[PDB]
Amino acid sequence: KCSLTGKWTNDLGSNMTIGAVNSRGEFTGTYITANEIKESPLHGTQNTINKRTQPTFGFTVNWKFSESTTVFTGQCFIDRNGKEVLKTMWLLRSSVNDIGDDWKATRVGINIFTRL
Amino acid sequence: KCSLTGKWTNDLGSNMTIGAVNSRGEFTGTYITAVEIKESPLHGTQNTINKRTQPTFGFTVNWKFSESTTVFTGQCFIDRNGKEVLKTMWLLRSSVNDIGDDWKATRVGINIFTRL
Amino acid sequence: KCSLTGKWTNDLGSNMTIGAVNSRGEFTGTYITANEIKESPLHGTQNTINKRTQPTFGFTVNWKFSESTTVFTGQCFIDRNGKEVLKTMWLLRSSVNDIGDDWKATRVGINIFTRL
Amino acid sequence: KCSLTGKWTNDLGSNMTIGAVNSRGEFTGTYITAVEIKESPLHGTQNTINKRTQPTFGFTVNWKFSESTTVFTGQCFIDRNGKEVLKTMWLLRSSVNDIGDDWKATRVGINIFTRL
Ligand SMILES: *[C@@H]1O[C@H](CO)[C@@H](O)[C@H](O)[C@H]1NC(C)=O
Ligand SMILES: *[C@@H]1O[C@H](CO)[C@@H](O)[C@H](O)[C@H]1NC(C)=O
Ligand SMILES: *[C@@H]1O[C@H](CO)[C@@H](O)[C@H](O)[C@H]1NC(C)=O
Ligand SMILES: *[C@@H]1O[C@H](CO)[C@@H](O)[C@H](O)[C@H]1NC(C)=O
């Protein structure tokens, strides 16, 4: 059973803490990224359908030092060793002033998370 | 100022209904898709920094008919007419059984929403 | 039979010209984007497997006014009317100076193309 | 200066071989994947503007065992050791029959290449 609760570090050095996942898959936590360190809240859910041991999930980071938003989505795996590892991908939405600048406002990438 | 509360419709015919956005930008709603109609819940946050009139935003749909999870993120624009438009991009995470299948698990696309 | 040859305009006002697709799916052309107008070469291929009437395809734009690169990929459709329409998505790779800036160097979006 | 010519291997075990990059940055190669081994051709261009020692780049794989097309794009870095690394993101376009299925046709992911 891979669980989202606990403290995680990613391939980029950023860290996150997720609280308890409730009966409806809902969960909250904080995302911690850099020197001088900033915290931002995050909210999401974990898919509970078929009570999968490696469930999908998604979660929104409400950046508190910029006007941006990032969503992450992925799955909670247990690798060959028995270790919990979060494979995710994200869309970073930047704020743009004009709707004509919309096409360039969304970055994409990966983040792998292990337990800290 | 572009607000997320209300009922929204997108380019694919899917419809969604967002509740009130509290002072920390948090919000809940339901997402409605077909092909016939299933409803799943969604959670997310609207970015509040600088109180922008076209904020960015992002939200997770906890699909209740499948093991999948989708995140959207984008911005709440005002078009040339004065209408409210949501420009979003999404990641659809599918469930895979083995971590070695993770590479093929994430679909990407766009959605544009107007009000109902 | 949807064909990639010809001149196309997209939802963002940009225009492209594609030459003949040869027996190995290979094709070249020029991408034209804005006021003051710039041209950049593009090279790609069209999937020929099963000689599908609506084939997939991909193509790289070698930007000549920046250090960036954009790839597009999609499918050549014939909609209900009988009209050729190119549904595509793209990754815009920006140049970054340091490998530690890699995570933020890739934008994603959509472009729909019709005949000009 | 990071060059693309040679044989490359990525995080998934896939291997590729790129030929010479001519003065306009154009190049050809073959892409090798398994699960057993199929080879498909690839075409693309390396961005030449400002003759950067870590250029961006992008290339289309014309898969010859399926109706699909994948594009990659990224940058040719030099890591702290002095090694050459290709940091890429990709879009995998699947063939769909009806335009109404287009929304679910595009997968996204990452690949990191080192030399053979
Ligand atoms: C990650 O957590 C460790 C230990 O709690 C800490 O040393 C490090 O500074 C954290 N990273 C960030 C970006 O806060
Ligand atoms: C969208 O909402 C309208 C009424 O609010 C309804 O007619 C239609 O069926 C909805 N679309 C879907 C996919 O449920
Ligand atoms: C698109 O093509 C039309 C006609 O050839 C032209 O008026 C327009 O300027 C083109 N767009 C760009 C960005 O070059
Ligand atoms: C990678 O290349 C090596 C030799 O060049 C070979 O052993 C291996 O099978 C290749 N990988 C694939 C997936 O073909």
Numbering used by the authors:
A (entry chain B), C (entry chain B): 27 to 60, 66 to 147
B (entry chain A), D (entry chain A): 27 to 61, 67 to 147
Sentences copied from the publication:
In the process, two crystal forms not currently in the PDB for the proteins α-amylase and avidin were discovered.
An innovative protein crystallization screen formulation called FUSION has been developed to help with the production of useful crystals. The concept behind the formulation of FUSION was to combine the most efficient components from the three MORPHEUS screens into a single screen using a systematic approach. Most of these additives are small molecules and ions frequently found in crystal structures of the Protein Data Bank (PDB), where they bind proteins and complexes. The efficiency of FUSION is demonstrated by obtaining high yields of diffraction-quality crystals for seven different test proteins.
